[PDB]
Design a protein around this ligand. Sequence first.
Ligand SMILES: NC(=O)c1ccc[n+]([C@@H]2O[C@H](COP(=O)([O-])OP(=O)(O)OC[C@H]3O[C@@H](n4cnc5c(N)ncnc54)[C@H](O)[C@@H]3O)[C@@H](O)[C@H]2O)c1
Ligand SMILES: Nc1ncnc2c1ncn2[C@@H]1O[C@H](COP(=O)(O)OP(=O)(O)OP(=O)(O)O)[C@@H](O)[C@H]1O
Ligand SMILES: Nc1ncnc2c1ncn2[C@@H]1O[C@H](COP(=O)(O)OP(=O)(O)OP(=O)(O)O)[C@@H](O)[C@H]1O
Ligand SMILES: Nc1ncnc2c1ncn2[C@@H]1O[C@H](COP(=O)(O)OP(=O)(O)OP(=O)(O)O)[C@@H](O)[C@H]1O
Ligand SMILES: O=c1[nH]cnc2c1ncn2[C@@H]1O[C@H](COP(=O)(O)O)[C@@H](O)[C@H]1O
Ligand SMILES: O=c1[nH]cnc2c1ncn2[C@@H]1O[C@H](COP(=O)(O)O)[C@@H](O)[C@H]1O
Lengths: 89, 482, 131, 79
Amino acid sequence: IHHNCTPEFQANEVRKVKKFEQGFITDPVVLSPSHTVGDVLEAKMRHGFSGIPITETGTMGSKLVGIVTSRDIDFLAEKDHTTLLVMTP
Amino acid sequence: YVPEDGLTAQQLFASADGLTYNDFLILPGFIDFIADEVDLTSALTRKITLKTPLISSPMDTVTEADMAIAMALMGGIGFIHHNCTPEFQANEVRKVKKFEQGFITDPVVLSPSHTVGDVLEAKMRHGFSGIPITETGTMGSKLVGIVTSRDIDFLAEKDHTTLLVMTPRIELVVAPAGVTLKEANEILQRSKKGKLPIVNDCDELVAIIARTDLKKNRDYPLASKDSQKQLLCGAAVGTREDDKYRLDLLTQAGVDVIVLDSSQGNSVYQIAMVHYIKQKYPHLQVIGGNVVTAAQAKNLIDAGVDGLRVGMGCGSICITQEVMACGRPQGTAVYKVAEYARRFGVPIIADGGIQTVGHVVKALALGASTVMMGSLLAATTEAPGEYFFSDGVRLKKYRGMGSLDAMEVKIAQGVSGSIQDKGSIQKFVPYLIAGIQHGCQDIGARSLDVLRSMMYSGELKFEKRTMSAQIEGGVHGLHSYT
Amino acid sequence: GGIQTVGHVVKALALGASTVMMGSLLAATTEAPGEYFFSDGVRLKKYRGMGSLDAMEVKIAQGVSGSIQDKGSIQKFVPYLIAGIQHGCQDIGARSLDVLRSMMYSGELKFEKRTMSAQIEGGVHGLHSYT
Amino acid sequence: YVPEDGLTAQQLFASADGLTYNDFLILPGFIDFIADEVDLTSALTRKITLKTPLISSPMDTVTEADMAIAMALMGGIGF
Ligand SMILES: NC(=O)c1ccc[n+]([C@@H]2O[C@H](COP(=O)([O-])OP(=O)(O)OC[C@H]3O[C@@H](n4cnc5c(N)ncnc54)[C@H](O)[C@@H]3O)[C@@H](O)[C@H]2O)c1
Ligand SMILES: Nc1ncnc2c1ncn2[C@@H]1O[C@H](COP(=O)(O)OP(=O)(O)OP(=O)(O)O)[C@@H](O)[C@H]1O
Ligand SMILES: Nc1ncnc2c1ncn2[C@@H]1O[C@H](COP(=O)(O)OP(=O)(O)OP(=O)(O)O)[C@@H](O)[C@H]1O
Ligand SMILES: Nc1ncnc2c1ncn2[C@@H]1O[C@H](COP(=O)(O)OP(=O)(O)OP(=O)(O)O)[C@@H](O)[C@H]1O
Ligand SMILES: O=c1[nH]cnc2c1ncn2[C@@H]1O[C@H](COP(=O)(O)O)[C@@H](O)[C@H]1O
Ligand SMILES: O=c1[nH]cnc2c1ncn2[C@@H]1O[C@H](COP(=O)(O)O)[C@@H](O)[C@H]1O
C-alpha cells in the first residue's frame, strides 16, 4: 500500500486487505429498526444495493432483529416514509 | 369597430399558387382557457373515433405490433404494413389485439419431462428463466410447477436431469382467471414472488404476470379500445387477387380497420376491392387509397369507403413527382379534398410531408380529421429494426415502400435512408400532444372540432409567407446555436 | 434541351411536343463517343456543348465542357425510360400520347403550379442520409 | 356533381410567369388499364413515325453510328 495519503487512510486500506474473506461481505451496511424506508432507499441510491440487515443498535455486534430488501420496499407508496419494523422479524 | 385582418381559407386558396404548409401561417385569436383544456377527439372513419389525431404509417420501417400497441395506448392507432407474409401480418395483428397491461403475451412454457438444459437454453435465447411448467408443456392444461434461476442456479454443470428442480403445484401461489391488477398487486405484495400464474378452476394455466412488469405499471386514460376493451389495430392491404386470402386471415385475427394501400386510389382495381370487402365483411371499416382531388374522391365515396387517405408526392422518402410528373402540393390537396368530403360525412387523413408540430396544426386547421406520420415516428424504440451506429450516432433504417430494397424492369418510386434515434413513443407522443394543445390555445380553439368550424365559418384567418418571411420565421443571425 | 428526368419527358409530351431530344441523359453511355476515364475512382465521359471553345477547333463561347458519370448501355437505359413514361401516362389516365395531347387541348387535362416550398416538398427531404 | 379542380394549360400559361418544367405538375385522373397497354407512337416529321418519342442529340459527345443504331433498335432515332 502506498503512503501518498493519510496514516488513518492507509491503515484502513491494510485492515480491508487483512480482514478479507472469500464469499463474505466486508464491512456490511446495517441499520436500526428505528430507521425509515427513506434510509433504505438512500442506501440503495448511494451504494447500489438494498439487502440491508437490521440490528437492535443499528450496527454489528448486537442482537439481530430482521432484514429489509427490495421486495420488502418495492410496493410501498412514494409518500410513505414510515419506520422499519416492512422488516421481516 | 375593428376592421378584419388576414384571409379566410377560401381566399387563401383562390389564387391557385400551389401552397404547402410552409407557405402560410395562422393568425392568433383570443385566449380565455388553458392549453390542457383543449380537446383532441378525432374521427378516423364513419364509425371509429380516437382521442388523439396521430397515426403511424403502414410502412415496414415504422409500424409493427409494438408500435401499434404503443400508439393505441397513447391514444392514436397503427396500421400494420403488408410487405410481409399474410400469416406474419395476421400474427402481428393478433399480438396487438390480445395485449393486456401488466400481463405477459405468449408466455414460454415447458413440460415436466424437459431438462434443465432446456431451461438454460430458454434463458440464453430469450433473456429470462421464470418459466412455468404444465402437464402437456403448453397453455391450456393442468399446471404442475414453475422453475426459475434460484431453482437452476446451484446445480452442477454436468447435470442435465429432467425437471420435476420444479416446485410442485401444491406449493404455488396462483390466482383465478378473473384477476384484476389490484388483486395481483395485493397477492404479489403478500407473497414476495417474482411470478404470478393465473389458472382455471381445474388448474389449467391461462395467464401469468411478472413482478418486474407489474412494478412498471402506468395509467393510460386515452387508450383506443373496442367493445371488448382490446386495443384497436389497423392493417394495410393491396388490390390484387392474393389480397383476398390476406383479408381473410386479418379478419380472423380481429382487425378493426383496413386501409387500401396505393399511390393512386382512383382505379377500377380499388373500386372492385372496396365493393368486395363491403359485400363479404359488411362490419369492416375501409379507408380508400391515396387521392389528391375531389373527382378522385367521388368515385371512392360512391364505392362505399369510410375514410380517405390524402397525399401524393409529399412524403419525405418520395420521388414520385420527379419520376411521374403527378401529384399536388399537400396543403392545397388537404383543403380541397376535406372541403368536398365533409359534405358526405367522410373524414380524411393527411398523409405525408409532416415534419413539425406546426405542420400537424396546419393540417388539422385545413380540415383534416387525422394526421399520419412516417418520418417523425421513425427511429423510435418501438419502430421495427435494430439500431446501428454510423460516426457515433444511433440510427435506424427508414425506407419508402417504393424503394428497390422494399421490392425484393421495376421503377423505383422511393428512397432508403436513416433517422437519428428519438427515444420511446410513450415519451415522444405526449410532447406532440402538448405542442398541438399550445397551438390550439394560441389560435383560440378549445377543440379541433371548434378549430375546423372556425375555419369553415371564416372566423379563422391566415397570412401567406414570402421566402424572406420564411427565413425570418426560423433561426437566423447567430454564430452558433443548439 | 433541359430534360433531366422522366417527369420532364412526360411534361414535355403533355405540353404538346411530339418527340423529345436528350443530350445529357444519353451521355456517358457505352454507345456514346469517347473513351471512358477515371477521376477519383468514378468512370466518366466527356460531355461538351457545340458552342464550347474546344468544339470550335475573336470567337465567343456559348457552351461549356464537362463530364457525366457512366450509365451502362442504351439498350438497358432506354426501356427504363419507356417504363417510366408508361407509368406516368397511366397515373394521368392516358392510354396513348395522342390521347394525352388531345386531353390537354380539350381542357380535360389539369395542372397545378408549384411554389418553391412545394418544389422542396416534392423532393427528398428530412433524412440524415439516403442513397 | 363534382366541381372542377386545377387549371387547363391555357389557364396555366395565361399569367405569363416564365414557367419551366419544375414550376408545375399534372393532376391524376382515372385508371382503367395497365401501364404496358400505353401506346407511345410519335410523329417525327410530316412523314416519319416512330414507336418511341426519344431522340439522341446531334452532338459530338452523344451521337455517332453506334448510338444511332442502338436508338433505332430501341425504337427512337439518332442524328
Ligand atoms: N401516395 C404516395 O405518396 C405514394 C407514392 C408512391 C408510392 N407509395 C407507396 O409505395 C407503395 C407502392 O404502391 P404502388 O403505387 O406501386 O401500388 P400498386 O400496387 O397499386 O401499383 C403498382 C401497379 O400495379 C397496378 N395494379 C394494382 N392492382 C392491380 C390489379 N388488380 N390488376 C392489375 N394491375 C394492378 C397499378 O395500377 C399500378 O400500375 C405503397 O406502399 C404505396 O402506398 C405512396
Ligand atoms: N448489506 C450489504 N452490505 C454490503 N454489501 C452488500 C450488502 N448487500 C449487498 N451488497 C453487495 O451488493 C452486491 C449486489 O447485491 P445482491 O445482488 O446480492 O442483492 P441486493 O443487495 O438485494 O441487490 P438489489 O437491491 O439490486 O436487489 C453483493 O454482491 C454485495 O457485494
Ligand atoms: N415465462 C415467461 N414468458 C414470457 N416472458 C417472460 C417470462 N418470464 C419472464 N418474462 C419476461 O422477461 C422479463 C424479465 O423477467 P423478470 O425479471 O420478471 O424475471 P425472470 O424471468 O426470473 O428473469 P431472470 O432469469 O433474469 O431472473 C419480464 O418482464 C417478462 O417480460
Ligand atoms: N408464484 C410463485 N409461487 C411460489 N413460488 C414461486 C412463485 N414464483 C416464483 N417462485 C419461486 O420463488 C423462488 C425464487 O424465484 P423468483 O422467481 O421469485 O426469483 P428469481 O428470478 O429466481 O430470482 P432473482 O430475482 O434473484 O433473479 C423460486 O424457488 C421460484 O420457483
Ligand atoms: O416509396 C414510396 N414512394 C413515394 N411515397 C411513399 C413511399 N412509401 C410511403 N410513401 C408515402 O409517404 C408517407 C410517409 O410520410 P413521411 O415519411 O412522413 O413524409 C407514407 O405514409 C406514404 O403515403
Ligand atoms: O454549346 C452549346 N451552347 C448552348 N446550347 C447547346 C450547345 N450545344 C448543344 N446545345 C443545345 O442543348 C441541347 C442539349 O440538351 P441537354 O444537354 O440535355 O440539356 C442540344 O440538343 C442543343 O439544342
